[PDB]
Symmetry: D2
């Protein structure tokens, strides 16, 4: 008689379970942790609030946490990112999950509240696993009594880590966090290769456009921008890159991309006159990758080539000024998470109008909104880090420390390099890769253990 | 002017024509030349320099001199000098001791001619090093000169490793700047420089088709990443070896098969541990590690007939060339190309089929068989070298009280703001246009509109 | 009260129409023909039996034939290739179409029969548009009388053209044909670049597998093999290629692939001992591209690495020995067109068994079965050629010619190079591409017209 | 006392011989022919006039002809293409060769005449091996009596075949020819992948310029322009392509290039105003690949970005208007085959002038002029076809045919596909590739012999 969940359709569970059984075979780092630690039950007593895209990959993460002893209550961190078969399979396993594809904002907030509250009162949570910081913010603003008994936060993504550091700087962070994003087996695997796999995927599923021979503009060349640029260049797009960071721009030039600004001399006045209309009038596809605000602005949207695709793969939809488009232009749904936005005006359009843009996932993360996000074998790295981070903070028991002892551990830290390497090794073995073992003489020559770690903490890979 | 030794001074006019082209390819370095000419920030600097005597190094040397410095220069490798570059520098009245094809004895004699002027220690007060050989000779043989030296700026991964070892052991006597770990060095030169120059060197030495053939790249650090791409972009089927599982994961995701020369990755020192089936299919092996003996005698015995062997790490002992010199007959094809006949030491059949081709006698192949990295890439490295010389010279460490010294005795990198300023001049060189953050966006991500744009933790 | 159709769900018509309007914007060659010829109605009196994948792209073709004066009756040429929203939109425009995704063989045969018959009697067809030759063969074997009134066949694909050339050599071909496949703007566009876009697309939709770092074997390196190999390599697969043709093998080597045989020394002795078990045990993905029979045989399937994906992008499913798999192994449906094939035997599978292969689209064309086939901007070339071919053979009126005139025109021919060039020019202008105009001096220098054709008939591009 | 040669430096022979011995190991098709035919001496009595770039590769070809029984007299077909060590090694083997790197035009013509004449009178030539048609033209215009006793011409390159086809159409061709260029193992090997190898090679040797991140324009997208574009794109250049052939242009778009014209709307109006000065002012590198005249004209050269590199890889230097630059601008030699062309005027220049172009090889084929041309393993295919073509025409003995029989055989033909396949098979084996053998059932299914040929003559690969 399990009823503590809300999903689109519980009858999708058998399909979900079939896809989780496949995903386990694609996630050797995560299933290596499930096997190594099952006997010790390192998360026995852990009560984890989780807010991360309710995908098949997240299903394998949740079932690993539970297999190691945890109880969880789960929600998705985006209105369009749930895979309803994954949510159904987790609910069918007796796990509280509140998530469906195509939530309203009001439904999204309700789902997070259903994880925080059990039977109308605060759950006895003692751990947080977050992607983006929405759940972390809600606890700090609305449930400070709950944070007293929470040992830590493990945060998936660049934007969430930024939010945590902002809190730590202001003295408002209440519990220590692990920056899961900045493991190399997360940042330089998931953020880059995941977007390489999933950006072109999402654009094909939404539009079935040919990409070969068409013009793209990628805004940003961080980890997401580098993967996104490759996703499109490998398909034969002519890609131009925009950046504010000249080091990232230098990489884009060396990687074979032209570096351009939407604005004349890179100076945005706020005026239409500052827009490079000739440049934007040639672009078939714009992708935002920044974690910043209004990097695809109203004046750019007005200047884009007719019938251009617009999408965002950064964490939050405000990278694109979709509010401007909702206020001024007519939205025609092609199919779910695909809109033609008619620049002829707000009330009504001609069905054969040529002056439209195609917006994917209403500006929300397009890989998860229009496809299935990153593949299992990539999310293996991110989620093996999540499990190690949950074990570490749970074992430290911050909530039970005296005040003077809390003050010494209240930090946002990354996992040790040795753990990042042990995750990587399982990922390499999963490809059938064979790492060389250093001879004792070689290990002495370069000043490392045969076991590693192999690099200094300053190393950038 | 006679205070120099080069292959042929008559090559000076050609070297000057190529320096004028290189200046047009090096906007970051020429931007510094123009920004700081007025102030003469290196007036009174006396720089001992030991780095590959190429056209690119010529532009560095003339930048230092234009900013007020005096220099004395040698190459840090027996095969890396461009004789036209060394001639142009000598013709400009700068002391330089370098030629392509030095013996080891000539190599040591060149470094000693920088250290000594007219038979006595030069009054040197700055060091610019690539690989640590000059640093090491000053510490072991000329410790007194180090009492008047304000610091060392070190170019390469291997040299920085040697500096950090000295610092660990308390033997380092002057502070150093790790130039290698600017992003506009490590993630520019080490990677993209090898992408440009490895296939260049192979083609000039052998003129072999690369497309369709099998390569093994040992290492997947910055040099191994660039080397793998140099080969893959030509259509090679590239396999990668690594001891670092994170670097191996990157190779797998970059589309390479990750393999070991040894069964299960375990080198037990015996022939039985060699994966003979794997090595018997390899047409090209490239070492990129900065480690010792990563292409060993048993690997060399197992390689496919007529495989090419080369090293692009700093030192020749990545490959066991000593083994080949002791066991096998060397046939010079042309300078820096040898066929190594596996049939015996004291002769070979001119038509023997059982040989390897060794490039640059196992020394850095890009510089030995071609011209190393291109100007527009070395612009990043060398703009960092100039900023690093200006910083340590302005700090005047040799002139500080003992207590002040002990606090400044470190191996540091340049600040990120300077790395970003070098990158911006490189981007403008390509006609790239960086976007300016709005005040609202700068507030939103918590940075200055001017930068720096990233925390020190950021890996790019 | 139109009712002369059978589709999955007429209510999908509005969605189909939205996608057709987008597809028109992606198909400048085909809509250039619709606009150039509308006034002249060159297919006035044409009654076309068509049997080509009922996709959005085929809808733009159909509505082009109709806009130039044709009547059509339409079936799909594959049980899984129909897009139900495309079939619905065509049914809704009052065109007879018999097609849905997931037909049985019996339902496939029934749909072809509904195009051939109108009200229980042979339709007064006078033109055939075919893909693969099945409708051509049915007319020749079962409705020979109908071929007396038919002016010609236009055939889309390599396999269909092979079958026509066989009929012509045996004297069994009754009407003239145009080989549409061998326009350069078909064979060197669709067959190659279409499979580049759509093979990785279909594998991602079916499995969501990471491709980067995994081992593929592509059987064949013709136009489909070339595009398929690029589809996988550009995602970071380690691709090996098999071939029987040493010229195509040479091209694969030069393109940077290792050329291997599933068989020791390339010799299939029919025994397990001739299988290269070491090679096949490292393969994560096998793709058949040959148009030949049993190129992924039972012994190969037994030797494949556990959890390998198996698929076919050739015209017919017998490239893979799926009959062996149905007889011997247990099929578990993951979701439509995705089956795990448990190598543990016939009489039950374990949900958690690790010893299975994944078969896509039951061995049928994977790009059309698991995704949407080639994109509109590629099918533009193929379908502009189809329209030109239909116009040409309909204008020649073979059925109306005296016997001695017929004998001189009974051929399998390609379209003239000038029309291939004019299709190409419209495709290039669709990218914003600008061709140079030869000066008269340069035209004279190379022996051509400023207007083209630019190349001799021998030219291979 | 052999003296019947002229080379730069006979002391380079031992170096040339060392490189020939390495080249033999890289040319398995050509050394397979040497082994197959040495016993039968099929070129016993052949007296071959040869005019083809005097490289190491050409050396292996010459020594193969000689090993099969031929005598030759040799010249280079370009003033800058000779490798002096190769010429020295051939002279040291007692073979008449007249060739050095850096000939004047007068020396070039003299070398060809030294092959034609032995001891001041016509040599008893009976075969011709040409690359570009210059020897063929001289024999037709100046030595018709020598053509009476010649059995055939074997022509290497696209430009030479065009010249033969013009002579055949005008009835002026006096002996039959084999078009070697249009073997697939020539045109789709040498012309494409040779230039892929050798273009970037020559640019790096001449300039040592970084190519990554810079802007290129390739004029033409036939076999040489396809290879050239890839040489540059694989280095990270941003490549734009010009074409007059829309089918070639459609290939460029689909391959991921922007297709542009040096002229506004592609139309040369006779004036500077029709030059797209905005486009050319961004180009760092222009490469001509056309076999046409003045495709990089004076007005394009005036508009190019300061410090741009200019080069040609088509057969003749007149692709670029170098006569304009010689008449109007000051040439500064950087080093051999590298000139800075100062656009500030003819008389002199400032050493630090910024307003110059860098011209490679004085506009002569840049791969051979600034590097070593194509590699041995590619030239293997071309030169195996040359040997087969020499055997074929020498065996046919056209010179000895009566007039009525000559008229039936006077043709420009390609080698049969079976021989092109046999060359490709030796090249594939050279890579370690393994071709699959068709089973009898598969051979019947696709209508071919198990031995091949595998494709119809219409097939384009
Ligand atoms: N969709 C996914 O699956 C996914 C995966 C990982 C991360 N993310 C999210 O993607 C975003 C980017 O993450 P990341 O790891 O690449 O961050 P990052 O810091 O590595 O890169 C962002 C880049 O944006 C650039 N930028 C900022 N403002 C700009 C502007 N106005 N114009 C141009 N460039 C500008 C920065 O200079 C920086 O290099 C974050 O919101 C992150 O949480 C999404
Ligand atoms: N030729 C050039 O122009 C050039 C340019 C830059 C640096 N360098 C030199 O190249 C070398 C490498 O520099 P880097 O910056 O790439 O260093 P790095 O530390 O980034 O990379 C070296 C890699 O070698 C790997 N490795 C070590 N031992 C190994 C073994 N036994 N088998 C397999 N892999 C092994 C390490 O795991 C590491 O990832 C250094 O010697 C450096 O000074 C040369
Ligand atoms: N799925 C699609 O959208 C699509 C697109 C175009 C064509 N097609 C179909 O794809 C198939 C191939 O078409 P194509 O145009 O590439 O034909 P093709 O003749 O160009 O190539 C087929 C290749 O298969 C090779 N081959 C044959 N038997 C082989 C074997 N046993 N092992 C290895 N290689 C073998 C041949 O040598 C040949 O090079 C045909 O059935 C055609 O109708 C499908
Ligand atoms: N350097 C080498 O080693 C090498 C190798 C092979 C061939 N070649 C020579 O290269 C040249 C090209 O040979 P190919 O086999 O590529 O010929 P091709 O006929 O395949 O291609 C030449 C292309 O140039 C295009 N073209 C002609 N005029 C043009 C113009 N004004 N603007 C743009 N495009 C234009 C044509 O449309 C055609 O596609 C010939 O001279 C040939 O002899 C040189
Ligand atoms: N399939 C997936 N399942 C769960 N989270 C994912 C998936 N694809 C991408 N993400 C995550 O989305 C985050 C952005 O909210 C990224 O940091 C990444 O770790
Ligand atoms: Hg979340
Ligand atoms: Hg999120
Ligand atoms: Hg750039
Ligand atoms: Hg040095
Ligand atoms: Hg060095
Ligand atoms: Hg791997
Ligand atoms: Hg069909
Ligand atoms: Hg079909
Ligand atoms: Hg010639
Ligand atoms: Hg020639």
């Amino acid at each position: 008689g399990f009823t503590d969940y809300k999903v689109a359709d519980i009858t999708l569970a058998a399909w979900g379970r079939r896809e989780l059984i496949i995903a386990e075979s694609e996630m050797p780092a995560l299933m290596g942790l499930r096997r190594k630690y099952a006997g010790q039950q390192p998360l026995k007593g852990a009560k984890i609030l989780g807010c991360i895209h309710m995908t098949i990959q997240t299903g394998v993460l949740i079932e690993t946490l539970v297999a190691l002893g945890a109880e969880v209550r789960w929600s998705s961190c985006n209105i369009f990112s749930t895979q309803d078969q994954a949510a159904a399979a987790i609910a069918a396993a007796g796990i509280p999950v509140f998530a469906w594809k195509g939530e309203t904002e009001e439904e999204y907030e309700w789902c997070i509240e259903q994880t925080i509250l059990k039977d109308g009162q605060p759950w006895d949570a003692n751990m947080v696993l977050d992607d983006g910081g929405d759940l972390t913010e809600i606890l700090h603003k609305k449930y400070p009594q709950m944070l007293e008994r929470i040992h830590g936060i493990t945060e998936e993504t660049t934007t969430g880590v930024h939010r945590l550091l902002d809190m730590l700087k202001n003295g408002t962070l209440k519990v220590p966090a692990i920056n899961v994003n900045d493991s190399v087996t997360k940042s330089k695997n998931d953020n880059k290769y995941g977007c390489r796999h999933s950006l072109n995927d999402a654009i094909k599923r939404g539009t079935d456009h040919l990409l070969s021979g068409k013009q793209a503009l990628v805004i940003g060349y961080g980890d997401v921008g580098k993967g996104s640029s490759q996703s499109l260049r490998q398909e034969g797009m002519i890609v131009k890159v925009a950046e504010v960071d000249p080091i990232c721009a230098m990489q884009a030039c060396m990687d074979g991309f032209e570096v351009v600004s939407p604005y004349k001399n890179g100076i945005n006045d706020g005026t239409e006159a500052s827009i490079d209309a000739a440049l934007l009038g040639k672009i078939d596809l714009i992708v935002t990758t920044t974690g910043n605000v209004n990097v695809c602005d109203a004046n750019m949207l007005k200047a884009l080539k007719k019938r251009a695709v617009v999408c965002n793969i950064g964490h939050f939809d405000n990278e694109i000024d979709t509010a401007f488009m909702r206020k001024n232009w007519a939205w025609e749904e092609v199919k779910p998470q695909v809109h033609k936005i008619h620049r002829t005006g707000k009330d009504g359009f001609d069905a054969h109008n040529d002056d439209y843009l195609i917006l994917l996932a209403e500006g929300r993360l397009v890989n998860l909104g229009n496809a299935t996000g990153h593949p299992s074998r990539i999310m293996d790295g991110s989620f093996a880090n999540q499990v190690l981070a949950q074990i570490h903070l749970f074992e430290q028991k911050y909530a039970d420390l005296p005040a003077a002892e809390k003050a010494k551990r209240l930090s946002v830290e990354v996992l040790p390099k040795k753990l990042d390497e042990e995750v990587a090794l399982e990922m390499v073995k999963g490809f059938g890769g064979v790492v060389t073992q250093l001879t004792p003489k070689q290990a002495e020559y370069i000043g490392v253990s045969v076991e590693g770690p192999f690099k200094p903490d300053t190393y950038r890979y």
